[model samples]
Target: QHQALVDQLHELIANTDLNKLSYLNLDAFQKRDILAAHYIAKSAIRTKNLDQMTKAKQRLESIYNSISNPL
Candidate 1:
């Protein structure tokens, strides 16, 4: 699960624009959220907490899904 989150984060970063990767643009909320999730995942790994890691990934995935298809 930790590796899964790492891979997901890698894919997200790869999909982002090179210029905007730095996240210095006016609208970088999505990037910010991704970064936050990445750090949270890392922390969970360090703490050896599977539940926390899974929840963090689930929350991040849900947020991204909503962003892609908002109601």
Candidate 2:
């Protein structure tokens, strides 16, 4: 389950345009979370920090999953 979420998160990151991560349509908190995850992932990559990278991916996945499967 964890790996699945991580994979999905990576896919999202790959598809997302970091230069245009719009928050115009999102709530304040959602926008904040998304941007935070974006930067976190980027920083992780810059530092070659696998732990932080994984953490960022998990966070992104959680945010996406919450929206996709809000129950």
Candidate 3:
């Protein structure tokens, strides 16, 4: 049940392509925020809390959009 949400979140992460293409040079703080948000989502999934997961994902994308590049 919850794994399904994880898969969906995984796909969302993949679609962003941040790990390989955009996350390489993200300054420490930005990366920290991203990582923390991701973890929040992970925990949200573990708890089957879709509401927090959605907020976490939105925060992730918000951070992504605020940056122009990692380098």
Identify the candidate with maximal lDDT.
Answer: 3
What number of clashing residue pairs does each candidate have, in the order they appear?
Answer: 0, 0, 0
Name the regions of candidate 3 deviating beyond 4 angstroms: 1-8, 15-24, 68-71
The true-versus-predicted C-alpha distance at residue 61 of model 2, in Å, is 0.7
Most TM-score-accurate candidate? 2
Q: Please provide TM-scores, in order, for all candidate models, with all chains considered together.
A: 0.50, 0.66, 0.63
lDDT for position 62 in model 3? 71
Candidate 2 residue spans exceeding 4 A from truth: 1-10, 14-25
* Ten contiguous residues minimizing lDDT sum, candidate 3: 15-24
Clashing pairs in 1: none
lDDT of 3 by residue, 8-65 (tens): 6766565445476464566777767767777787788778798887787777667656
Per-residue CA lDDT of candidate 1, range 1-71, in tens?
Answer: 66776566446444443354454332467667776776776677678677867766676667556655635
Q: What ranking emerges by lDDT with the best candidate at the front?
A: 3, 2, 1
Question: What value of lDDT does candidate 2 attain over all alpha carbons?
Answer: 0.67
Superposed by TM-score, candidate 2 places the C-alpha of residue 71 at a distance from the truth, in angstroms, of: 3.9
Ranking by TM-score: 2, 3, 1
